[PDB]
Amino acid sequence: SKNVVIYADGVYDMLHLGHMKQLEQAKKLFENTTLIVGVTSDNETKLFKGQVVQTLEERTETLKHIRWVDEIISPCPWVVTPEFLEKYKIDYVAHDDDIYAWLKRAGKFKATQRTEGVSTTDLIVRILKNYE
Amino acid sequence: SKNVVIYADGVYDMLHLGHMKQLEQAKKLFENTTLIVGVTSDNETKLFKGQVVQTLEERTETLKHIRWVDEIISPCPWVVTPEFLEKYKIDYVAHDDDIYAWLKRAGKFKATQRTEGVSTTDLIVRILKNYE
Ligand SMILES: O=C(O)c1ccncc1
Numbered sequence A, B: 001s002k003n004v005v006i007y008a009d010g011v012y013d014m015l016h017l018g019h020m021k022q023l024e025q026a027k028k029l030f031e032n033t034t035l036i037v038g039v040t041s042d043n044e045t046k047l048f049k050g051q052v053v054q055t056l057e058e059r060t061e062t063l064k065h066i067r068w069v070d071e072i073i074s075p076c077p078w079v080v081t082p083e084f085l086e087k088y089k090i091d092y093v094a095h096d097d098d099i100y101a102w103l104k105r106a107g108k109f110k111a112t113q114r115t116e117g118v119s120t121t122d123l124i125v126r127i128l129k130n131y132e
């Protein structure tokens, strides 16, 4: 039945299994979907969120290799607007966890979940606790 | 035309863009392929190659999220045998760079290439040279 357009934005820095579980989840919200991933720009991220270690090109080249990803918007806008939804014909925005209030109010919000500990920072911890 | 079975084995530890470029390359050796990825066991790797930081389960869960990967054998045998080719009906083995001599001799070897510097170890270097 109807193909549903899903939009998930993020930094997607040092992409780990937690990101991928999230993308798979968005991708499978409905039986027939197109998953659009948005990749935040270097400057906006570092100005609003924090340090990023991978460039925009690098963070986006990786997402191209993920099975669940159908389209990539890179760079994507930092805030999602109603115009943005209409331009890309987006039916739902998928993200963890108001700045999402207006999307919930419109019934266009689908919550997805983070997976803890599986991150690339916590992997060096493992390498490092080879040493007392 | 004919669907070609491709087999690429590896450790696939802390999967980076270099691994993924390799898998994409194997996947696209022929127009119609099935790419089988083999994931080496924890013990055999640590006994023959070196330390691995991710478990077998973890290294395999990640590969499931890669677009190019059609089938996963986990754990895969450490050495590839002619029996192994017949059991999984494999037409070509894809790997970098003899222990591949017999496969070349049989015309069943397809070379793929590593991409340098894009590895997860070299990313902490980048984080770290935030400090003089
Ligand atoms: O990663 C995030 O929370 C984010 C997503 C989209 N725009 C800005 C930040």
Ligand SMILES: O=C(O)c1ccncc1
Residues within 6 Å of the ligand: B009, B010, B011, B012, B040, B077, B078, B079
């Ligand atoms: O990563 C490798 O070189 C390897 C591949 C398959 N069997 C053992 C080692």
